[model samples]
Target chain A: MKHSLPDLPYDYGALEPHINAQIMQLHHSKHHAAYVNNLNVTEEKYQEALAKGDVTAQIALQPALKFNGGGHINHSIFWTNLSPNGGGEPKGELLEAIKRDFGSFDKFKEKLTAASVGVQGSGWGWLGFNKERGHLQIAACPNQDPLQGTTGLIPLLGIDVWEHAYYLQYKNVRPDYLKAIWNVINWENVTERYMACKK
Target chain B: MKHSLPDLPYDYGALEPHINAQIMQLHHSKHHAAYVNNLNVTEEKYQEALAKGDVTAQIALQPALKFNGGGHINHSIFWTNLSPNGGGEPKGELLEAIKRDFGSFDKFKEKLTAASVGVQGSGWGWLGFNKERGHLQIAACPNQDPLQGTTGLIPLLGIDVWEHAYYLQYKNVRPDYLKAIWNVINWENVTERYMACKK
Candidate 1:
């Protein structure tokens, strides 16, 4: 089966004042779409290499598979992780875990913000659930690397730090972009992801 | 000793219509400046770790050293690689060598452009001199990884594929920026670097 670009749950302008309409439009339509399209192409090539047992071609295809595949997976979740009506904090077990693992919601935000802003180049900062430790963890993945694949953590929330994510409106001030994104985080969606992983 | 940002050989607006003044201004004063400052700080920390003989701290500092140091190194050369009056083609031994290695100037440009545009995320496309092979080779480096340090390819010219390099003007169309940059390439400077490497 081939992967496809997921539609933004909300309109491009939905995250406005924080992310800006132009950024979302370009990101979803151009950036994420290309990843999906390329992923299908790469998969097709990989299948051919596999059939022939061509080790060289298969080895060469790994980076494209990881990058484009990760892009598709990350963006699919990212669209759902944000909502126009979202923000504040997660409730019940999610809020409890937050307090237990990170002390408080504010602390979690601070740590995640620091991680996101500290990315040297294009990447994502994730608030993920570590099943082995049964605790929440903060991790950063460079480029399009998926959180779960790279860190063995179940992603509940992610903040994209890629230049395309915030550069237009925020320019060189990445911390400002990090601060504003908090206003539209879908805590309810995050809690659902957490619950699913726990079960 | 603390590292410092090198001054751009020309004014910010010198590249003009090919690359806007704002992009050059931010790419220099903000982007390159941060790399220099951070490189100095990382070197200082590394010195402390070395004096303590703490392998853990020394290991932890490697990424920082590479990222900031490479950013500082890459941008310093990048600044000199472009000129208001640049673009067209190289002359003399440089031209002769390019022809010998890559077949023709147009073919070299095509290969370099493809490499630059093909970068999955933040990175650089380089036209480097391969000392071992005695030929010019094209390569790409991800996220400020310097050409020489990572691949032993002596850097002659580099094209930054990091979104910050072109996103403001080119948006998601990186190829356009690649196309335009050729108009301002300091070929004379590239030839000079090529000359030094041969000796």
Candidate 2:
């Protein structure tokens, strides 16, 4: 299947007051789209090199493919997991499970927020379902690593930690941004994801 | 001044469910305290070298001080900034400024969350007040760097991304731990720091 920019579920400005239209537009169109484009190009080159048995070319292209491809995959999921009107307490099974596993949803949020805010460079904060262990978990990834590829966990919800995400608006005050974003959390979406993963 | 482990503002298990008592106890007493001890030892050696004008000794000790001293200073702030009853929302000027700067709090959270979750190796996520520019900023530091020492922004709140912070409970799945920590964010402390720095 051909790669294309995934349509955002809501209008660019729909998330406004929380996320600015300008940032969402640029983040989705310019930044994420670039990764998709570059990923396709890299993958095409890699396939060609593989078919020709050009080991050197394939090896040389590894870094580019990994970075760009991972970026594309990651950002795609990131966009859908958020909503302007989202945030607040999770309900039903997801909420119950969160409380059971981590004691309470509030506590779970605390650990996840600390880990997410603790990232050193470009990475992601994921609330994932560990299928093997049959439990909900939180994790962080450096750079553009996809959660499944790096941690064997099924990503349910995620937060991106790239400087570009908030530098323009929050400048260097990341905690303020972190503390505020919880207001718009799409708990329903997360609950749906949790149910799907359980099967 | 002597580098010592700062007493945690609340009981170790106060952040229970979010951060277990065992994790906090070990993280503070064993891990962070070690950094302090090593930093002091290294500093004493460096002071002796400086007194004797022994450039060679000073040079030799650079790596030691940078690593351990940085660890001590960073963890000290991290301990106090977190509390079991933490997390809610910012008020006053910090709140107003967050809205103004980030367009809204939710957008800011998305940005900061992304940055913190993206860290490579051990490091820190910071919400810093840039006194020089009078703006809030988000930045990450590799290893144990004090935020201001590396980025010129005064750290208002910090998150530790070391494996020791969550490896036992979360294993390699750092995201689970990170997401959970948000419950205990100590917003009042962060705002106080921001206000103090503002002046």
Candidate 3:
């Protein structure tokens, strides 16, 4: 089955002030939509190559497969990772685990922010659960590479840093966009992702 | 010795009409130079990381190293792969091999153009010699990844699809740029590269 673009959990303006409505509208409707559309197209082309046993065509389509597939996965998770009534702090088991793994919740935020800010080009900063270690970790992937696929980490939260992500309102100040993102973090969704990964 | 940007073999205006003088100047003086400078810095940092046994730092520097390293190598060859009096066709062994591997010189050009125009984002389309197979092949690489380093295909000719390579001149019409570049192909240079690989 072809993957579909997911609807945002909340309305475009739900996370107002923290993220502008325009960015949300364009990001969800345009950017995310494009990824979903391209993914469907790439998969069909890939299927044709497979059916024909065309190795050359298959090899050539790898970039589109990775870029679009990762884009779809990341954006789907990202929409859920925010809420109108989100932010402040995670609580209970998720909070305790973050403290144990990162020394404190503050340290976790600091590390994630640095990873987000330090990305040189279009990419993502991820806070993830390492299944092998059974601990929280932070990582970065360049150019829409899926965290799990590329690094074998189960994603808990992600920060997008692609220029199209923030260029309209935030312009070249990616840090500003990154700083504002924290204000709308949906700890509930992240906690659920972490809890699911723990199992 | 550390890598440095070599001056273009021909003057900026040498590959005029097809490539234009402006693109040659910026692509060489600005873009290629930046890659060379950044490669030096990344290599030095990589050395420090190696000395310290800092695995994370070493891994982190890989993309920059690949991007900048590939830029240096590709642009260095690209300068020689064009001339005002270039284009027409190859002869001798190169022509024989093209027909042997791809059916005809025209077919080879068609495949290369399709690869170049089909690049999803910033990348390159290359005509390369497969050392192991002892045959000619075409490949595409994402970003500035070198063909030989990434895929072990010794590059004979490369078509850069990075937006900066053509955005100013072609203005978002990358197919036009890809089409124009064929007119300036220095078949002699490609033939020499093919011959060198055989030895």
- What TM-score does each model's chain B reach against the true chain B? 0.98, 0.95, 0.97
Q: How many residue pairs clash in each candidate at the backbone level? A: 0, 52, 0
Best by TM-score: 1
Tell me the tens digit of each residue's lDDT in model 3 across B29-94: 877898899899999999999999999999989978988888898889888888777889889999
- Report the C-alpha lDDT of model 1 over B108-134, residue by residue, as the tens digit: 899999999889889999999999988
Residue pairs in clash, model 3: none
Task: Provide the lDDT at B5 for model 1.
Answer: 87
**Runs off by more than 4 Å, candidate 2:** B1-199
Candidate 2 per-residue lDDT, tens place, B42-139, comes to 88998899999999999988766877788887878887788776887789998887887777877777667767766654678888888877888889
Ten consecutive residues with minimal summed lDDT in candidate 3 chain A?
A163-172
Ranking of candidates on TM-score, top first: 1, 3, 2
Error of 1 at B183 (Å): 0.5
Q: What's the true lDDT of residue A6 in model 2?
A: 85
| Model 2 CAPRI rating | incorrect
Question: Taking the tens digit of each residue's C-alpha lDDT, what string does model 3 give over A1-199?
Answer: 9798888999999988878787788789877887899899999999999999999999988888998999999999999999999989999998998899888988888889899977754689999999998888899998879999999999999998875666556655577888888889999999999889865
Candidate 1 overall lDDT versus native:
0.93
Q: Model 3, A37: alpha-carbon shift in Å?
A: 3.4
Candidate 2 lDDT tens digits, A1-199: 4578788777877766666676677678876887788788888998899999999999998766777777888887777777876888888888889999999978998988887876654678888999999999999987777898878898888887765565445544567667766876777777787899965
